Amino acid sequence: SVASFVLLSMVGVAVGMCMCARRRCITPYELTPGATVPFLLSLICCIRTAKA
C-alpha cells in the first residue's frame, strides 16, 4: 500500500514538473503578438498554433 502510494506520488510529481515546464516555455509565445510558435515546439509541447 505504501510502495504503491509513493510510486504514484512520484509519477504525479513528474507530471507536475512537465506541466510547469510546458507553461513556462510557452507562455512568452502567447504573450507575444502573433503567437508565432515554431512547428517543432508545437509538436513537443502539444500546443496549438496562432491560427488554430
Partner: protein, 151 residues
C-alpha cells in the same frame, strides 16, 4: 495619440487594458475586471516575470486592435500624456509627465504602431525612466530601470 484602446478595468482606475495586435493586454500588477463585457469574460495568461497578462481578442472586435511592431529606432515616440524620448534602448519622459494609474498605456511610433506598454518608471531629477513591456522578433521582453515604481 488619436486612438483610444485604453479600457478601464475598475471603478477606481489603476492603469488600462489595451488591444495590441491579436492580443488583449494589461499589467499583471493592476487589479480589476476589464469593462465592455466582451473583454471582461476573457481568460488571461499571467507571467510574473513580465508583469503582463494576455488574452485572445474576440474576432468581432479584432478590427479595433492597435497596429503593432517590434522595431524600435532611436528617436521620439508618442503617448496620450505627451512625447517619449527613446535613447540608448530605453524610453524616457519628463518628470510629472506620467503618474500612478496611467500604466497600461501603449507607446506609439510615427506610423501609429505600438512598440511598448508602460508599467511604471523611476524618477531621476527632471526625467523619469520608464519600466515597459516591449517586444523583439518573436519574443516578449521587459525593461526595468533601477528604482522604478509600479504605476
Amino acid at each position: 495619440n488619436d486612438c483610444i484602446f485604453e479600457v478601464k478595468h475598475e471603478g477606481k482606475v489603476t492603469g488600462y487594458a489595451c488591444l495590441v495586435g491579436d492580443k488583449v493586454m494589461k499589467p499583471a500588477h493592476v487589479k480589476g475586471t476589464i469593462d465592455n463585457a466582451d473583454l471582461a469574460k476573457l481568460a488571461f495568461k499571467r507571467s510574473s516575470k513580465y508583469d503582463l497578462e494576455c488574452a485572445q481578442i474576440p474576432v468581432h472586435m479584432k478590427s479595433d486592435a492597435s497596429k503593432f511592431t517590434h522595431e524600435k529606432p532611436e528617436g521620439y515616440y508618442n503617448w496620450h500624456h505627451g512625447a517619449v524620448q527613446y535613447s540608448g534602448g530605453r524610453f524616457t519622459i519628463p518628470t510629472g509627465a506620467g503618474k500612478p494609474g496611467d500604466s497600461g498605456r501603449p507607446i506609439f511610433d510615427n506610423k501609429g504602431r505600438v512598440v511598448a506598454i508602460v508599467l511604471g518608471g523611476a524618477n531621476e531629477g527632471a526625467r523619469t525612466a520608464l519600466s515597459v513591456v516591449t517586444w523583439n522578433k518573436d519574443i516578449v521582453t521587459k525593461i526595468t530601470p533601477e528604482g522604478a515604481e509600479e504605476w
